[PDB]
Design a protein around this ligand. Structure first.
Ligand SMILES: [Zn+2]
Lengths: 101, 189, 72, 120, 55, 144, 81, 139, 143
RNA sequence: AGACUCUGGCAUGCUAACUAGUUACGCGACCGGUCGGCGUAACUUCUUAGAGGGACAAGUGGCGUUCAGCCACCCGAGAUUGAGCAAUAACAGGUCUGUGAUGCCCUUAGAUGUCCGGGGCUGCACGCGCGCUACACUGACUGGCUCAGCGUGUCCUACGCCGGCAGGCGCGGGUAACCCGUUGAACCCCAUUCGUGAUGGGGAUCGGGGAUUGCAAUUAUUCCCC
């Protein structure tokens, strides 16, 4: 079984890398072939808006932003191992996409 | 060695006045093939006295709304003007620039003293850095007006005005505009 | 005053082209258009013929500024 | 009267696709997109009004609220009241009249007359 | 109104088919990224949706 | 001393290939050579009576530099400021039919083939003609 | 069969101002005078363990004229990350 | 027998590759004399004429500039060539040649070796650009 | 370059003061109903060098220049180069010259006045007819 | 206030990339050079984005109530950018027209509620504010050349065919550093023509035709050609 792919995606890096260093540590003690987490670029969802809800003020604007960090980590193992690695270290706020073959 | 545009030597150029010895540009060390060095000459005070004068002329000549950012279109005008100056004078064209900014640099000028609407002038002398800075802009404005509304091109007009200013003739806009400031400063002293 | 020029040659213009041009010390289409009261396009078209006849050296040729010099 | 090399008789007896072939771009686009259900009921009513009219007396005025109607050559001579926003207007439908829209003949505004400005 | 002529106008094209999912108002709508929120109710729920005014 | 197209002045390259196709004689000359624009943002006529040939030379060297590009890409090569009158200028693409009838005639002269993974690329046959004209104009520049 | 609701107690009820600000709303709605219930909430959350807190109640408190009422004690950080 | 450095301006980034060779310095396939702004060609000539062909006869440079505009591109090639020769004569050749080359280039121009720290200022509301503002009127 | 002894200075073709002291390409721009583009296409179909001036033409050259612009279709001129396409009356593709421009424009103006349209009334009143805003503009020509 | 947080300049030290890139080798293709033209060995300099480092008036010389600190210089990437947040006390500043926020209310069945048709918000003698084009030669036309960055996109679009353009047809990819895209952008760079002329500068106004979006372009919606 080859090209099993795990994609971690979240909102903040203080919780993304806390989980991203956890599943790559569970696969290491199992003696598997691990590919390092490659960074897939941060998306800056930028929305500018008027502060004033009536449009009378001095034309002041809010630059609201969402930052999306993307991670790609690759494994080469049968599919029962990746399920038991992923299912134990479940952390809210960071989510996992699993593509098989 | 290091020539101006690879052909013109600045080492055989002599500065005449002691008032413009250290505030003048290249004699031995600031020699560059091109003006276009893109250095920072306005970050600190008295950093403009160390840039080459080809930079100062190039930066001053690009002063209009239509061509305020363009610069590669400005170095060719200066190059062509230098070729024309060398054709007329028969010698190093960079000595002509020095002899022209010497005879065009103002020496005495007035000061706005009093209230608004009624000028009451009083003569003060011109600082050497402002003496260097002022003479280029008058040349540029005269070239702008003249080559703005005749057949005559920018480079030809700049070259002929610079040569007539080196000769100190009254047919040049650079030598003209020193005279009004000088004679108003005469009227007050 | 208003500027009226000649798009083509005149009898006196071509005679001035042969005897006066190689002693200007600056040969420019602007100078020809000023002195000889003709269009600047005609000056360029005459100076190309003068280059073809081998009597005038060319220093710098460009879109706008073209620089000529007399021979020797 | 002759419209684009064509007199009125050949205009009246001709077909719909060739009528498209005669008109200009907006009219051709509107014909190809298709006349709608509400615009289809005006055709039968204006045929009814012209049919019951005396042969000397032009058919009576019919009110409508469809200012965007292209005048077909079959509509020539039918008096139609066009709504300007408040009232209806009497417009004579000529043989020359076919290339335009109804709404430009029922004037929505009033011609502007100007007086002395008050503290302006 | 009459059943055949109450919503007879199609409501797919035109901004009147688009209203804010919070306040049902249609002026100042953010359709970028499929928010479909009013520009004035956006400043209310910006912190809760996960938007941070970092800079 | 291997003369390559990239080692030759591109302007001198494109003025040394228009005459190569005139003496060749084989070329599909469209009806709109003396007629039409070259882009929607154009206001006047090309001065050259043989502008369709230098268009082909420019297209050929563009496919030489970067192959696998279609007609929509040549609309983006020959675009420019579309002075919209009083309105500020913008970007405008070129005509999608003149470049079309250049690329489609390049198969007629057997420099260009439709590759399996996209648009049009150069055959290894026309690279010889390109390097020959490159060598001859390079010798003309470096000798006299 | 895909949603599971679980009601849980707050770790510190006084310290969480989201749960606390709804208590003063109910206290005002119950017929209390504003200032007394505001001091009640204020001293409850001051004793709860916060380094500082404030309550601003604005509106028609004692008249058709809308004055503003402000209770500040302890520390506060009004600016900076 | 090879080093790889990069030169940089506002946005352009030229990467040089110092392999030992015969003296060919080509920028992305086209030669040094061939970059489209011809006047600034003299600018592209200012390192070599300050360093001499005799120390370039064993060096081949491949410049891979990808970014910037038309002028910031040339300064990237400038910077990459200069610091590429510095690194090449540092790793394999004695420090004296590197130091004298560095001294000559510094006494010509400092920006020939160090990168420009100034890049674009972010535009702000109420103005056309970075620091400019919109027109205002009075009574 | 040559000095033309036979050089007509000022042309009078189709009742228009044509200046021969200019390029032939931009001298035909002076007449009404012909601008730069149509003149350039007509002269390119006439195989005339654009370097040649307007006053340097021969008699047969002037005659063929006049005959080309009259009926353009047989002279390899497309249908979209014309001042008027298919008209209301005849629907004929035809290029409009200086003499026909004035009376064609006045009959176009008088066509909509019998029609009594919005554009006809706007033309009759001197206001903008293209839906344009003249609340702040149109001061020129008014009082 | 400062500190803080985000962004920018620096790391040839670290982390690791087949959804990024280079080098080598091989395969070609052309005349030892070029390939954005093809695949596996490395590799992280270029590209990504995370940690850590780095800059402090640090060192030197003057000034100094020789304190606090101020001018100048070496070395350094930087002797230092740009924003976010912003105290106490206030304003009869704007918003009931952003809310299923809202107190007193007015109306509530030929309704100030809902929906539909059309018009109007854009109507023009004139005035007041931003903004955009220009007044030409440092310019305009045409041909050739040649470089980005935010950042969108289930609609974005590649490619092929018909058309002069606007457009139309077919077959694809992309729910996305995977595709558009190596975003062959403009100003600018070279060459041609125009040469001071309300001139080809500059396109306000006006006719005719064409195509698209939409139930509906009449009040020219736009876009294209004389
Ligand atoms: Zn929202």
């Amino acid at each position: 079984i080859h090209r099993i792919r795990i994609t971690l995606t979240s909102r903040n890096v203080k919780s993304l890398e806390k989980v991203c260093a956890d599943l790559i540590r569970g696969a290491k003690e199992k003696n598997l072939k691990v590919k390092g987490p490659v960074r897939m670029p941060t998306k800056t969802l930028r929305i500018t808006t008027r502060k004033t809800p009536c449009g009378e003020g001095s034309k002041t604007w809010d630059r609201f932003q969402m930052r999306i960090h993307k991670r790609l980590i690759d494994l080469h193992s049968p599919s029962e191992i990746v399920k038991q690695i992923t299912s134990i270290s479940i952390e809210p706020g960071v989510e996992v996409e699993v593509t098989i073959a | 060695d290091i020539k101006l545009f690879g052909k013109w030597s600045t080492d055989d150029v002599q500065i005449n006045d002691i008032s413009l010895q250290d505030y003048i540009a290249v004699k031995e060390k600031y020699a560059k093939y091109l003006p276009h060095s893109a250095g920072r000459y306005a970050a600190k005070r008295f950093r403009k006295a160390q840039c080459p004068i080809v930079e100062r002329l190039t930066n001053s000549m690009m002063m209009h709304g239509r061509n305020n950012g363009k610069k590669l279109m400005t170095v060719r005008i200066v190059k062509h003007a230098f070729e024309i100056i060398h054709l007329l004078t028969g010698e190093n064209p960079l000595q002509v620039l020095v002899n022209a900014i010497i005879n065009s640099g103002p020496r005495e000028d007035s000061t706005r003293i009093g209230r608004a609407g009624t000028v009451r002038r009083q003569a003060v002398d011109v600082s050497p850095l402002r003496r260097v800075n002022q003479a280029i802009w008058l040349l540029c404005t005269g070239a702008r007006e003249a080559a703005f509304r005749n057949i005559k091109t920018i480079a030809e007009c700049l070259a002929d005005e610079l040569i007539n200013a080196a000769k100190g003739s009254s047919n040049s806009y650079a030598i003209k505009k020193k005279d009004e400031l000088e004679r108003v400063a005469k009227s007050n002293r | 005053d208003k500027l009226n020029n000649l798009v083509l040659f005149d009898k006196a213009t071509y005679d001035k082209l042969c005897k006066e041009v190689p002693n200007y010390k600056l040969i420019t289409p602007a100078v020809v258009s000023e002195r000889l009261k003709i269009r600047g396009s005609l000056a360029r078209a005459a100076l190309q013929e003068l280059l073809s006849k081998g009597l005038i050296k060319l220093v710098s040729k460009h879109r706008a500024q073209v620089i000529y010099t007399r021979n020797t | 009267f002759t419209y684009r090399g064509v007199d009125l008789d050949q205009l009246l007896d001709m077909s719909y696709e060739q009528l498209m072939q005669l008109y200009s771009a907006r009219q051709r686009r509107r014909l190809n997109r298709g006349l709608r259900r509400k615009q289809h009921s005006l055709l039968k009513r204006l045929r009814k009004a012209k049919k019951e009219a005396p042969p000397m007396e032009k058919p009576e005025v019919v009110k409508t609220h469809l200012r965007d109607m292209i005048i077909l050559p079959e509509m020539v001579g039918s008096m139609v009241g066009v709504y300007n926003g408040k009232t209806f207007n009497q417009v004579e439908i000529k043989p020359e009249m076919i290339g335009h829209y109804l709404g430009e003949f029922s004037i929505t505004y009033k011609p502007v007359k100007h007086g002395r400005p008050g503290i302006g | 109104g009459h059943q055949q002529l109450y919503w007879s106008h199609p409501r797919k094209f035109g901004q009147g088919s688009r209203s804010c999912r919070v306040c049902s108002n249609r002026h100042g709508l953010i359709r970028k990224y499929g928010l479909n929120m009013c520009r004035q109710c956006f400043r209310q729920y910006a912190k809760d949706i996960g938007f941070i005014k970092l800079d | 001393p291997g003369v390559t197209v990239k080692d030759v002045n591109q302007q001198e390259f494109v003025r040394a290939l228009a005459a190569f196709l005139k003496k060749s004689g084989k070329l599909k000359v469209p009806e709109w050579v003396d007629t039409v624009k070259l882009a929607k943002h154009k206001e006047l006529a090309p001065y050259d009576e043989n502008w369709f040939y230098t268009r082909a030379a420019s297209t050929a060297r563009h496919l030489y530099l970067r192959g696998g590009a279609g007609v929509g890409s040549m609309t983006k090569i020959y675009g420019g400021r579309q002075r919209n009158g009083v309105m500020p200028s913008h970007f405008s693409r070129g005509s999608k039919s003149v470049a079309r009838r250049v690329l489609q005639a390049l198969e007629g002269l057997k420099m260009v083939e439709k590759d399996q993974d996209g648009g049009r690329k150069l055959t290894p046959q026309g690279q010889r003609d390109l390097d020959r004209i490159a060598g001859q104009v390079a010798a003309a520049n470096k000798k006299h | 069969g895909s949603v599971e609701l679980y009601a849980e107690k707050v770790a510190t009820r006084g310290l969480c101002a989201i749960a606390q600000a709804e208590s003063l709303r109910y206290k005002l709605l119950g017929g209390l005078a504003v200032r007394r219930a505001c001091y009640g909430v204020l001293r409850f959350i001051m004793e709860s363990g916060a380094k500082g807190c404030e309550v601003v109640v604005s509106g028609k408190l004692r008249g058709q004229r809308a004055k503003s009422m402000k209770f500040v004690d302890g520390l506060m950080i009004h600016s900076g990350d | 027998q090879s080093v790889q450095v990069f030169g940089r301006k506002k946005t352009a980034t030229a990467v040089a590759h110092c392999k030992r060779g015969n003296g060919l310095i080509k920028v992305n396939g086209r030669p040094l004399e061939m970059i489209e702004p011809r006047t600034l060609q003299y600018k592209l000539l200012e390192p070599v004429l300050l360093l001499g062909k005799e120390r370039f006869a064993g060096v081949d440079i491949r410049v891979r500039v990808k970014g910037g505009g038309h002028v910031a591109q040339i300064y990237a090639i400038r910077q990459s060539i200069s610091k590429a020769l510095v690194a090449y004569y540092q790793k394999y050749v004695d420090e004296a040649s590197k130091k004298e080359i560095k001294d000559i280039l510094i006494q010509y121009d400092r920006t020939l070796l160090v990168a420009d720290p100034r890049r674009c200022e972010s535009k702000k509301f109420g103005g056309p650009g970075a620091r400019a503002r919109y027109q205002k009127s009075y009574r | 370059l040559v000095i033309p002894e036979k050089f007509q200075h000022i042309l009078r073709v189709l009742n228009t003061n044509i200046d021969g002291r200019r390029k032939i390409a931009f001298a035909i721009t002076a007449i009404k109903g012909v601008g730069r583009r149509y003149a350039h296409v007509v002269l390119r179909k006439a195989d005339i060098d654009l370097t040649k001036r307007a006053g340097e033409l021969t008699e047969d050259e002037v005659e063929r220049v006049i005959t080309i612009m009259q009926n353009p279709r047989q002279y390899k001129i497309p249908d979209w180069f014309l001042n008027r396409q298919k008209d209301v009356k005849d629907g004929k593709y035809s290029q409009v010259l200086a003499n026909g421009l004035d009376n064609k424009l006045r009959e176009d103006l008088e066509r909509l006045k019998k029609i009594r349209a919005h554009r006809g009334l706007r033309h009759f009143w001197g206001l903008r007819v293209r839906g344009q805003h003249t609340k702040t503009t149109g001061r020129r020509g008014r009082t």
